[PDB]
Design a protein around this ligand. Sequence first.
Ligand SMILES: O=S([O-])[O-]
Ligand SMILES: O=S([O-])[O-]
Lengths: 196, 199
Amino acid sequence: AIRVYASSTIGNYILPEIIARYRRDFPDLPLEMSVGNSLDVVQAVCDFRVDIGLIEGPCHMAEIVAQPWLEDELVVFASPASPLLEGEVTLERLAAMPWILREKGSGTREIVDYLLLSHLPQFRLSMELGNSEAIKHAVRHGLGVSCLSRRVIAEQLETGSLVEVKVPLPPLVRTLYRIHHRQKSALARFLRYCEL
Amino acid sequence: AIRVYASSTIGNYILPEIIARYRRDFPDLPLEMSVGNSLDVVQAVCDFRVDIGLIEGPCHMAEIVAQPWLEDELVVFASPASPLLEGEVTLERLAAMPWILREKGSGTREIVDYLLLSHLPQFRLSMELGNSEAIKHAVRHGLGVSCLSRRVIAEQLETGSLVEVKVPLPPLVRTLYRIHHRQKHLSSALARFLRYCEL
Ligand SMILES: O=S([O-])[O-]
Ligand SMILES: O=S([O-])[O-]
């Protein structure tokens, strides 16, 4: 049996298909998947409840072995009818927007705090939501702007109900990590399917 | 000064359109939205942390006033390659498929257990997932079968990545409840927001 805990982006937009490919080639092999945020994954790995954990924020703990797994780009997005789309986008223009952010303790919020909102002086924090679907649908209804992994809003980017905003910053690329406890099981068979 | 705590189905697929229309005609008034599961909302209203709660499961707590608000139709669904799609679907066939269900404390978990899972004897619980999106894509890739609100899987029901399964049972309709504390009856500004939540 394998126990995997993934953060929101991974557990909802990367992991389901991997399990499909895994349980296709290995039926009768158990897999219990749990999805929370990056903090919940880290604490669940520390408690010896899961075998491996997949996080989208950093993790600098002595008892945790973190290895880079995939790359992921966060994007500022807005509704197509947003005034931010017309004209040159600057830092001061982005700080003046109503930002809908993920709760503190999520990897998305921590990374965007480091790469983006760190340079938006006194950015207006309009709403804090505990999941990215509520953030996605709020932004597409013109309730503000946000920053999420491209995997979360991919379908809405192609459909058109959400438009990527050109940010005057280097691309907001982040690393998704695989973690496990140092002091801690057919994982090699499962880790095969997490390769590109 | 209005704070609303809603469950995952309501917060993700209903409230955004309402709040947008509300902030359009009333841009001044503040509006704080929080989304969790049904137990999150119930516990928050009991603790006076939020003015009103919107849930997708029953709530029978003593000092919580629950009133039906909307109706919501749950759907048994699977991938286009499931054996549940053809023949007469029976309860023994349904119980024999891998069921991906929500975590306990979700209104969806409690309602499908009462209206459906109670009638599938010895159903296999393949997985338990904390959110309906992971469920939606797990079944979309073929991991099994589940039951979610039609609002959650409407996009996929359209394109065909997910297919509705006919259940030999009455249509699985649930009631979305609006709750508040028996001690704190809702204010007048809160009432104006409720007009926008109605059909
Ligand atoms: O769920 S993640 O954004 O930590
Ligand atoms: O998240 S809901 O099912 O309470």
